[PDB]
Design an enzyme around this catalytic site. Sequence first.
Site, PDB file in Angstrom:
ATOM      1  N   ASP A  12       0.924  -1.139   0.000  1.00  8.61           N
ATOM      2  CA  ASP A  12       0.000   0.000   0.000  1.00  8.61           C
ATOM      3  C   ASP A  12       0.960   1.183   0.000  1.00  8.61           C
ATOM      4  O   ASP A  12       1.644   1.396   0.998  1.00  8.61           O
ATOM      5  CB  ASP A  12      -0.866  -0.018   1.273  1.00  8.61           C
ATOM      6  CG  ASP A  12      -1.627   1.267   1.545  1.00  8.61           C
ATOM      7  OD1 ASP A  12      -1.601   2.175   0.678  1.00  8.61           O
ATOM      8  OD2 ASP A  12      -2.235   1.375   2.626  1.00  8.61           O
ATOM      9  N   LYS A  73       2.938  11.523  -3.419  1.00 10.55           N
ATOM     10  CA  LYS A  73       1.754  10.928  -4.062  1.00 10.55           C
ATOM     11  C   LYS A  73       0.800  12.008  -4.571  1.00 10.55           C
ATOM     12  O   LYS A  73       0.040  11.761  -5.509  1.00 10.55           O
ATOM     13  CB  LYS A  73       1.037  10.017  -3.046  1.00 10.55           C
ATOM     14  CG  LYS A  73      -0.073   9.174  -3.668  1.00 10.55           C
ATOM     15  CD  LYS A  73      -0.457   8.042  -2.744  1.00 10.55           C
ATOM     16  CE  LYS A  73      -1.687   7.375  -3.250  1.00 10.55           C
ATOM     17  NZ  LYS A  73      -2.092   6.292  -2.322  1.00 10.55           N
ATOM     18  N   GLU A 177      -7.113   0.884  -4.377  1.00  5.14           N
ATOM     19  CA  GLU A 177      -7.122   0.759  -2.909  1.00  5.14           C
ATOM     20  C   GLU A 177      -8.480   0.214  -2.403  1.00  5.14           C
ATOM     21  O   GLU A 177      -8.452  -0.762  -1.641  1.00  5.14           O
ATOM     22  CB  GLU A 177      -6.811   2.124  -2.255  1.00  5.14           C
ATOM     23  CG  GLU A 177      -5.326   2.476  -2.308  1.00  5.14           C
ATOM     24  CD  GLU A 177      -5.013   3.957  -2.213  1.00  5.14           C
ATOM     25  OE1 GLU A 177      -5.858   4.721  -1.698  1.00  5.14           O
ATOM     26  OE2 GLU A 177      -3.918   4.355  -2.661  1.00  5.14           O
ATOM     27  N   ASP A 201     -12.866   5.426   3.706  1.00  6.00           N
ATOM     28  CA  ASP A 201     -11.438   5.627   3.876  1.00  6.00           C
ATOM     29  C   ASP A 201     -11.080   6.995   4.421  1.00  6.00           C
ATOM     30  O   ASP A 201     -11.042   7.978   3.670  1.00  6.00           O
ATOM     31  CB  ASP A 201     -10.741   5.364   2.536  1.00  6.00           C
ATOM     32  CG  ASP A 201      -9.228   5.229   2.580  1.00  6.00           C
ATOM     33  OD1 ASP A 201      -8.613   5.667   3.587  1.00  6.00           O
ATOM     34  OD2 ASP A 201      -8.654   4.684   1.606  1.00  6.00           O
TER      35      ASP A 201
HETATM   36 MG   LIG Z   1      -4.714   4.630   2.353  1.00  8.04          MG
END
Ligand SMILES: [Mg+2]
Length: 390
Positions: A12, A73, A177, A201
């Site tokens: 991840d 990211k 994800e 999330d």
């Molecule tokens: Mg995450």
Amino acid sequence: GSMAKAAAIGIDLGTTYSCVGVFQHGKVEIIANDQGNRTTPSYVAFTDTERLIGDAAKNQVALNPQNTVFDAKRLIGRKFGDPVVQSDMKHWPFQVINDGDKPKVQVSYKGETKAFYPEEISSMVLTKMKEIAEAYLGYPVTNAVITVPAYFNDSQRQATKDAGVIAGLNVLRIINEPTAAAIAYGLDRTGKGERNVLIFDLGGGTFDVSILTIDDGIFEVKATAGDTHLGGEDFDNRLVNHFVEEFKRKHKKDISQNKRAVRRLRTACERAKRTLSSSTQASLEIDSLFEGIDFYTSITRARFEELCSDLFRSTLEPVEKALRDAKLDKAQIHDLVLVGGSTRIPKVQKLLQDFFNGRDLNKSINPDEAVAYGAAVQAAILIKSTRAAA
Ligand SMILES: [Mg+2]
Ligand SMILES: Nc1ncnc2c1nc(Br)n2[C@@H]1O[C@H](CO)[C@@H](O)[C@H]1O
């Protein structure tokens, strides 16, 4: 005959933290790094003598803000002119430069000014995750599944693969994800018929809601929604402002202009915030916080809940929006999955459970580990090379 194959890993590659897992002996092992941490900061720091990655980079950030890179990211696969990039740059202490409308981070490193593409910084984080896995397995690792947000476009997905390739990894697949979190719970192994799954999330800095449909193990992304301005750091900010006011009332002193005191306060606030997820109150004890004054106080879970009340409630707006976009009613959702450390907050859990009329939340896999867990399950499936029997 045929030599045993090395295990493949699931990574991840997170905005703030990354996590690595391996599926062996019919189960996933989330691999701790050499400081005993099951998640590793997605940070890279540069000095005159070293390049530090993970906990070593994050632990020295206070005095080296210009040469410690995080949040790569947010730049990966984006153009320098992208309005998202332009706004994010105002919050970062490190320099972001324009190289042919492509952002690069510029730092002082080993006596020189060096600029890196976001995929190069991400390859450094991936190299640390590969080494963490190899320290546990006791052999070199080659194959990996890497996850990305469901909203990542082709350029963002290709730049993530490029980061894996720079790190010396063979990227088996780039998977979403929310799909990986669903795979972690075996939600693609429930047989024939459609299942609607909502992934909730809540990260350090952003909030994402995804609705997936699973039919015979096939995933379809039905809707994505969220809030780019909602995360764990906002709850920490509310505690910071509260204790700054408290010090002002109690000692008639404003600490807000001593960066060290504010930083020590924020660090203590984040730990107190974590304690409040398991306890109904938490102590805060800082020695010589400001002007040699010891700050020994406490906060109840009820006061913390009141301080962040509007922020916690606002997580339900993207849930309702995602449900409208998926053209589904809340009763039509079969499974609810929690992702992100911030989902351990009891009040966040209660608000979402109340919204879905008392339904159980899947939270048995550590929410900060579920994505890597699913990625590790998929990595083991992808390397199988079974030849059918007659
Ligand atoms: Mg995450
Ligand atoms: N037990 C926990 N209760 C409340 N919050 C938590 C917990 N564990 C983690 Br991890 N967090 C927060 O998750 C975010 C991940 O980037 C950060 O804001 C962490 O503070």
